[PDB]
Symmetry: D2
Subunit: 286 residues, 4 copies
Amino acid sequence: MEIVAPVITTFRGGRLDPELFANHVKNITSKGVDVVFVAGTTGLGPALSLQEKMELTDAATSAARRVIVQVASLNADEAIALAKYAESRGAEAVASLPPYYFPRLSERQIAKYFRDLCSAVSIPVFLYNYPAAVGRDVDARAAKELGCIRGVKDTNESLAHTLAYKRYLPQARVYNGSDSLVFASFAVRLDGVVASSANYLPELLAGIRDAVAAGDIERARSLQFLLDEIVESARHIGYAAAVYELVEIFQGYEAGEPRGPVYPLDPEEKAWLRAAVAKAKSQLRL
Amino acid sequence: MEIVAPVITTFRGGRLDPELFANHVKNITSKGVDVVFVAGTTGLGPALSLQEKMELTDAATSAARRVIVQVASLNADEAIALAKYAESRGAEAVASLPPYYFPRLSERQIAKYFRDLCSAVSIPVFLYNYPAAVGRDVDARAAKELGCIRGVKDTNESLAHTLAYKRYLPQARVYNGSDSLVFASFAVRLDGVVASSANYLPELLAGIRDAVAAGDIERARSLQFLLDEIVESARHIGYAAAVYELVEIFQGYEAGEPRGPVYPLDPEEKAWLRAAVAKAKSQL
Amino acid sequence: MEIVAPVITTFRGGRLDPELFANHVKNITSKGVDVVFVAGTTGLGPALSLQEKMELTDAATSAARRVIVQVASLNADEAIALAKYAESRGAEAVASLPPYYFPRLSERQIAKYFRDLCSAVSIPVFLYNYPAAVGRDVDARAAKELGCIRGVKDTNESLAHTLAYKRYLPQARVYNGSDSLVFASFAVRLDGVVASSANYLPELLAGIRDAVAAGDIERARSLQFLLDEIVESARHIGYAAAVYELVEIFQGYEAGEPRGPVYPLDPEEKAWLRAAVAKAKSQL
Amino acid sequence: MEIVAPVITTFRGGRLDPELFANHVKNITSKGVDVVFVAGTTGLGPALSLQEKMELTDAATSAARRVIVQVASLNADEAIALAKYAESRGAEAVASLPPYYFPRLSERQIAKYFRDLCSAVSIPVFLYNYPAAVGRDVDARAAKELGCIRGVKDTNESLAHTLAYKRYLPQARVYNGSDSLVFASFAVRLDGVVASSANYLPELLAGIRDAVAAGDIERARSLQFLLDEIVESARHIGYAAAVYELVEIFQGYEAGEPRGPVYPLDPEEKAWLRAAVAKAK
């Protein structure tokens, strides 16, 4: 079972900084991250231009052996274009959010989107389902009807919703994308987790996977609860920007910055976060 | 890890039939059910008069050794009165939904409700959280703050939400109440499940539990999917009435009927259901 | 266009004081309330026993010439009984919430509930739609499908949702149940409003209606915003209980009190609310 | 009180077509539309590149006297840059959706976004509130708190939510953005409506506005109800793409296409929509 990092996109000076990125990718993959999921929500995908996602694809694929590239764009030609680019850079799969933002697109329009994506590449296409962000759900039944989905990341608090894809798509690789379900996802044997904490605490996640494999549910759960406390703190000051600061706190290197409207934490917010997670990081030392 | 049955309330004619009820409890308790949860949502709790919940308490505490009685009422005095009655009948705990229907009660109100329940009895008071029905959530932080909650049934698709109660009340017994999470609940070692399907397929839930305990996570999951397929068909025509028909289908006896506004299935609905589950009743 | 009051249910001691209730009905019908809507949500309907609703039905039809009685119950038989009793005391119509609480209910079961209600009486049956409380919406299309709705009270922030019933049911009386849309509802010419604030500021509602008819939209809107400030303060400490206190504050007499789990405001909350509405009170 | 059109963006073969655009703009503005709201939701704004939004600003300011350009972008530098460009092109105001997509950004991040916009230009900045699409609400109190909002478009079925902006921001021009509230917006005297149907039936909106002003509430309402039946059919089929077909059907010229993932309607869908609306009273 895999630990997939939806890796952060590391800006410095308003532009992407590969190498902050690559040092980061190399760090986390050396600490239990199996797969790198680039241009995910944690990596600000919807906020990146096509060309930024191309740079990220190049940086991820040269820094890691297993890469999935998230390709959604509200211009579908760019999603197709990027899919092909990622495939040519050796990505093992591409993923896409359903068309987001626009309320009540039709089923036919969602279906054409994913079907054009499947036609464009030979590597597997994953559905990246994220109803809270996307404003729509593509559930297991709908994903099966698309007829080409070979993988799912379901960022969903409903573990049943995620398990349902293994039911309808017995051959698909199915992942839960929620940090609060990491323990549970290994326990029910999903194919893996895509968890944002894989950026700052991948060794905690591997700790959990190890515990679950050993049958040590008490340790798994307890490490989960620690992770939850950390997540909770970060949610409090704005989670997308806090991921970067947690990386620095936990991993000890410069992580770059997001870009607005996901503005970087200011120094007050960073000081606060650092204190907030110290209660629970002596409880750590992994 | 326990299988708790939110046992159906078994009307016949239009009135409670306590002997269908007891036959039913005795059967499922011999087929894997560890605790009877009387007057829950599946038992139509909120549609029942105080006297009816009383009669149902007598039947449960007669038919079964472990009974938790669900006492919520939109007259808090009837909740307290039933709690005391439940204890006097030998119930091992009582449980309550939070005050429901009325939007935006204050926290002081909700808290005074639970705290008045705790002070009325010496057996444990369980929170029964069911945001989708109740229209408000009392999460683990809120439950810890109530100060007297000894157990939780959380009917919630969000397993992390259920699991939080173990985080904040590690001494409480915490159960998840969604049928779609039975496998997962056992997998993550909650204290057990309260699942509507304990009425009609208790031995399937004991199977899932057994398989989880072996390590046949793959068997567990596969049993769970069988179970999801059945719940889905029943959801299609009205789950609350359909539970009664599923009991007949799988357990083989008369299950009585719900009471309107939860009207009993009509012949067409039953035939459809019978036919819809026949697909998966064979895969059993 | 009518001002309908969903009158509070006045408890003192733990029990209904129907003299309080009648003095309250008398006072507010003398100040611009046209219809009395008994036992709705503001009246703690779902929290009331059949006997409490019969008592309110008696006192209301005694103190007021136009009474709609809200009858919903999670025992459909009690709803039918109350409807029939309401007819017999001279209610001009009955209303019901759809079956609430239970999430797992079929259209057949909702349709049957209203149709049996329509069969039970000859006076009109209003749908009382209130999705946020009820957990279910019966929209205009669904309401037309029922084939017997003669009126609608739609407690809904979506004014379009409410207007939809006039489109789908042109002969029905359609009322909006939201305090924040009183001004809007008069402006679009719904048949009227059923507004909780009719308990405590019926003359503000009449002032809005006058202003709208005088084409003085700016005064209409400004009275509405004054109302909103008062409602928002009340919402902060627990709206259901605060309504009673607002009656005392603005009407000058003892309104009695709700009943737990809708516990009465405590003295600190009453004091807070009096001071919160004082700014807006002096500006009428 | 104004009729503001959140005007469709007219593509041909997935490329922007300024001539279709300009013809559509000139036509609807001669039939009642007072203001052109460019690159809003009906205009596929979040789907458009910066380049395309600049071309659209150019075409709209060249084809219409009053134009508000919607500038939201998930790269905030682009929103700022487009606000400056729109101002330089003579927009009477810029609007912005709050930052969208990303759940749970901080209030500080949202406030910074809007204030950076306000600082970037001298023309009014409008809040374009659309909780269903955006995933967050910037309500009247929050809007006042921003401290620089001078207009609001509120796409919201809750008319009271929209009227609250008039209470907290008495100088703000406030519009409701929902087609089903055109009649009610005029009746409660909001500053106007930004209704997607102004693309296809501007003269029906003008009619509702005239009926309200003449005290003819029963006509307003039944015109509103005619409109609701049309919108309902379009919704049934994919509203965003249906809008283009409705322009053609109702205004009698070509409207171009949307661009995928908002794919154009197919033949069967267009035929269904035509029948649905011919029947629609």
